[PDB]
C-alpha cells in the first residue's frame, strides 16, 4: 500500500550504511591513499 | 566546369578546367562542383586529389601537406609536394607504409591512394 | 444510448488522433528534409538535381507514412471495426 | 498478479515497522563490502604486485579523488573521498547481487525473490539521499557560516531566481533518491512480468533484461557517487 | 518452479556471455596493471642499484 | 442522450485534433525550412533566387499536408461520417 | 440531459486543441526563424536588411497557419457546426 | 444534470489545452531565440547591442502568440461561450 | 450500454493513439535520417551508394518501430483484447 | 451527479494539461539555452562571465512563462472559475 | 454498466498512450542517432568500423525505453491490473 | 456514483498529464544539455573540469521544473483539491 | 456502477500518460546524447574513451525521468491512490 511511504527501516539501513562507511574511512581509503602516494 | 590549379611551393604544377574535384579534408571527404561556395580547408596529411575532366581521364594526385581554396571561380590546391599519377612507383610508396617516421608513412599512403591500391 | 453512437464517437476520436499524428510527422519530416535540401543547394548548386534523388527518397519515405495513416483513418471513420 | 511492494520478513519493534527482506539484503551487501575491505587490509602491498582486490579498490579511489580534485580539491574536502567511494561500492554491490538466480515460483503463480536489491525499497534510497543531504549541507555551513550559507544558496547565481533556487536545494536529495529508486524498482517489476511466460520462453527476456540491469546498476552507482561529489563541491564554494 | 527454471537458464546464459566476452578483457586489464606496476617496481630497484 | 449529440461531440474533438496536428506540423516545418533559407541567404547575398525554388518545394510539401488535414476536418465537422 | 451541452463541451475541447496546436506551431516556428535571423546577423552585420525578407516570409507562413487555426477555433466555439 | 456543469468542465479542459500549447510554444521559442543570442554574443562579443534588435522581435512574435492564448483561454473559462 | 460498445470505443481510441505516435516517430526520424543523407550527398556527391548502408540501417530501425507499433493497432481494432 | 464534482474533474484535468505544457516548454527551453551557454563557454572560457547576462535573460523569459502558467493552474484548482 | 468494461476501455486507452509515446521516442531517437552515424560515415568512409560501437549503444538504450513500454502494455491489455 | 470517484479519476488523469509533460521536458532538456557537454569535452580535453559548472546549472534549472510538476502531482493524487 | 471501476480506468489512463511522457523524453534525450557521442567520436577519434564519461553522466540523468515516471506508473496501477 503506497510503497513510497517511508518506514522504520529507513533508520536501520542508515545504521548498516554508516558502519560500512566507518570501515571504508578507516581500513580502506587511508591505506589506499598511502599506497598511491608512496607509488 | 571550374579551373583547378595544383600549385606547389617550388613551382606552379598544373592548371586547367575540370568537371569535379574530389579530395579529403580534415573532417572528411569533399567534392567540389563548378559553383561550389567559397571555402578554405586543410587536406588530410595523406590526402589524394581526383580531378575529373571533360573529355579526359581522371587526374589522381598524391598530395603532401596541402591546402584547398574554393574561390568564386577557381579551385586552388596548395601542396608542399604533389605527385601526378603517372609519376608514382608502387614499390617505394608501399614500402614507405608502416615506417617509424609519420610523414614518410603519410606520403606512402597518399601515393597508394593515388594509385588506387588504398 | 445506441451502441453505434459510442462506436462512431470513438472512431472519430481515433481518426482525429491518426490525422493529427500523421500531419505532425509529415510536416516536421518534410521541413527537416527541405532544410537539408536548401542547405545542400546553397553549398553545391550543381548538385541540385543529384540532390533530389535522396530528398525524394526521404520525402516518399515520410509522405508514405502520412498516407498510410490517412488510409487507416478512412477505415476508422467509414468502415469502423466492431461497428454494429 | 504482481504484488508490487509487499515486503516479506516484515516485523515490528519500538512501535515501528521494519522490512526484514530489505534489512537482510542491506546486511548481506554490507558484509560483502566489509569482507572486501578486510581482505584488502590483509593484502595492501606498496612493495609487491597488487592483487585484484587492491586493483579494484585503488581504481575506485583514483576515480573519486580525480573527481574531487577537478571539482573542489582534495585538501578542502578530504572526507568526500571516503563518502563517495563507500556510496559507490554499496550501491554497486546492492544492485549487482540481484543478477544471482533467486526468483522462484511462489506456489500460486506469484514470483518470489529471496534477494531483492534494497534500492528497490524507498527506505534505502531515502536513507542514502538524506544522509548525503545533511552531510553536504553541514559541510557548506562549516565552510561559509551558519547564516551565510543559506544566504548563499538562496541567492544562487542571480537573486531574481530565488524562488527557483530553493527548489533545487530541495530537488537535490529527492532527485538523488528517486533516480536510484525507479532505476532499481523497474528491475523488480520487469522480471516479475517476465515470470509470466513459460519457462521455455522466460529465459530469453529474463537473460536480456538482467544483462541490461547489470549495466543499469553500475551506471546508477556511478551517477549517485558523482552527483554526491558535485553537490559537496557546489556547497563548499567560497 | 517453472519460473525458477526459466530464471536459472537465463542466469546460465548471462554467465556464459560474461565469461565469453567480458572476463577476457577485464583479466587483460588486470594483468596489464599488475605488469605495469611490477615493471615500475623493478625499474625503481635498478635505478637504486645504478 | 441523442446519439447524434455524441457523434457531433466526437467529430468536434476529432477535428480539433486534426487541426492541432496540422498546425503543429505546418509551423515546425515552415520554421525549419525558413531557418535553412535564412542561413543560406546570410552565407550568400546573391544565392537568394536559386534558394527560393527548393524552399518553396519544401513549403509545398508541408502546407499541402496541412491543408489536406483542413479538408478532412471539414469532413469530420460538417459532413460527419456515421451521423444518424 | 440537453444535447447542446454535450455539443458545446465537445466544441470547447476541440477549440482548445486547435489553439494549443496553433500556439505550439507558431511559437516554435517563429523561434526557429528568429534563431536563423539572429545567427545570420551575427555572422554578417550588413545582412540585416536583406535577411529581413526571407525571415518575414517564414514568419508569414507560420502566422498564416496560426491565424487559420484561430479562425477555425472561433468557428467551432462561437458558431458550433452541428449544434441542435 | 445541470448541463452548465458539462459546459464548464469542457471549457476548463479547453482552457487547459490552450495554456499548455501556449506554454510549450513560448518556452521552446524563447529557448531557441536565446540559444541564437547566446551563441552570437559568445562568438562576436562586440555585436552584443546589435543582436538585441532581432531578438526582441523574435521573442515578441513568440510571446505574442502566448499572450493571445491567455486572452482566449480567459474567454473559455471566465465567460464560457455557449453557457445555457 | 452494451459492454462491447465501450470496449470497442476504447480500442479505437487506443489504436488512434498507436497510429498518432507511430506516424510522428516514423516521420520525424525518417526526415532526420534523410537530412543526414542529403547533407552527405551535398558535401560529396559521389558518396550516395556508400551512404545507403547506414541510411537503411537507420530507416529500418525507425520503421521497425512504426510497423511494430502498427501491428498492435490491427490487434486493437480487429481482435480487441479483453473483449466481453 | 453533483455538478461540482464534474466541474472539479474538468478543472483537475485542465490544470494537469497546463502544468504538462509548462513543464515541457520550460525543460526544453532551458536545455536549449544551457546548450548554447555550454558551447559558448567551451569555445571562450573568458566568456563565462559575459554569457551569463544573456543566458539568464532567456531563463527569465522561459521560466516566467512556466511560472505564469503555473499561476493559472492554481486558479483552476483552488478557486475554480465558474464553479457552481 | 459492467465495471470490467470501463476498466478494459481505460486499459486500452492507456496502452495506446504507452505505445504512442514509445514509438515517438524510439523513432525520433533512432533517427537522431542514425543522422549522427550517416554524417560520420559521409565524412570518413573508413570511420564506419569505429562508429557502429557508439551507435549500437545509443540504439540500445533508446530501444530499451521502447521495449519496456511494450512489456507494460502487454500487462495493461492482457493482464489488466485491478480488473474486477 | 460517489462523486469522489469521478474527482479521483480526474485527479489521476491530471497527475498523469503533469508527470508526462514533466518527463518529456526533463528528458529532452537533459539530452540537449548533455549533447552540449559531450561536444564541448570532445573539442578539448581540458574543458571537462570547468564545463560541468555551467552544464549542471542547466540541469539544475531543467530538473527543478520537472520536480515542481512532480510536487503538484502528489497534491493531485494524495490530497486532491476539492475532493468533497 | 462501481466507483472503483471509474477510479481504475482513470488510474490506467494516468499511468499510460506517465509512461508515454517518460518514453518520449528518455528516447529523444538518449538519441540526442548518442548523436553528440557519435559526432565527437567521428570528429575526434582519439577522444573516444574520454567521451564515455560525460555521455553516461547524461544517460543516467535523462533516463532518470523515464524511470522515475515508471515508478509512479506502478503507484497508479498497482497501488492506485484513493482507490477505496
Numbering used by the authors:
A (entry chain b): 22 to 60
B (entry chain H): 3 to 120
C (entry chain T), F (entry chain S), G (entry chain R), H (entry chain Q), I (entry chain L), J (entry chain P), ...: 3 to 86
D (entry chain a): 10 to 247
E (entry chain d): 1 to 50
Paper text:
The membrane domain of the mycobacterial ATP synthase is embedded in the IPM, with the catalytic F1-domain of the enzyme extending into the bacterial cytoplasm and attached to the membrane domain by a central stalk and a peripheral stalk (PS). As do other ATP synthases in eubacteria, chloroplasts, and mitochondria, the enzyme couples a proton-motive force (pmf) across the IPM generated by respiration to the synthesis in the F1-domain of the enzyme of ATP from adenosine diphosphate (ADP) and phosphate by a mechanical rotary mechanism. The mycobacterial rotor consists of a membrane-bound ring of nine c-subunits, attached to an elongated central stalk, made of single copies of the γ- and ε-subunits. The mycobacterial PS is made of two proteins, bδ and b′.
Extensive classification of the data for the mycobacterial ATP synthase revealed the presence of not only the three main states referred to as S1, S2, and S3 but also of substates within them. Substates S1a to S1e are in S1, and S3a to S3c are in S3. Thus, as the structures of γ-subunits are highly conserved, it appears that there is a conservation of an energetic mismatch between the two domains that is independent of symmetry. Thus, as illustrated in Fig. 3 and Movie S4, by using the c-subunit directly under the ε-subunit as a marker, the rotation of the ring can be tracked through the substates. In S1, the rotor turns almost one c-subunit onward (ca. 40°) from S1a, in the direction of synthesis (anticlockwise from above) to substate S1b, which also moves the γ- and ε-subunits relative to the other states. As the inhibitory tether is attached in some of the particles, this movement of the rotor in S1a and S1b may also be responsible for additional differences in the F1-domain and the PS compared to S1c to S1e. Each nucleotide binding site in the three α-subunits and in subunit βTP is occupied by an ATP molecule with an accompanying Mg2+ ion, while the site in subunit βDP has ADP and an accompanying Mg2+ ion. The sixth nucleotide binding site in subunit βE contains an ADP molecule with neither accompanying Mg2+ nor phosphate. During rotation through S1 in either direction, the γ-subunit approaches very close to the PS at b′Arg72, and potentially a salt bridge could form between this residue and either γAsp170 or γAsp171. Unlike the tether, which can be formed in any of S1 to S3, this feature can form only in S1, when, during rotation, the γ-subunit comes sufficiently close to the PS for a salt bridge to form.
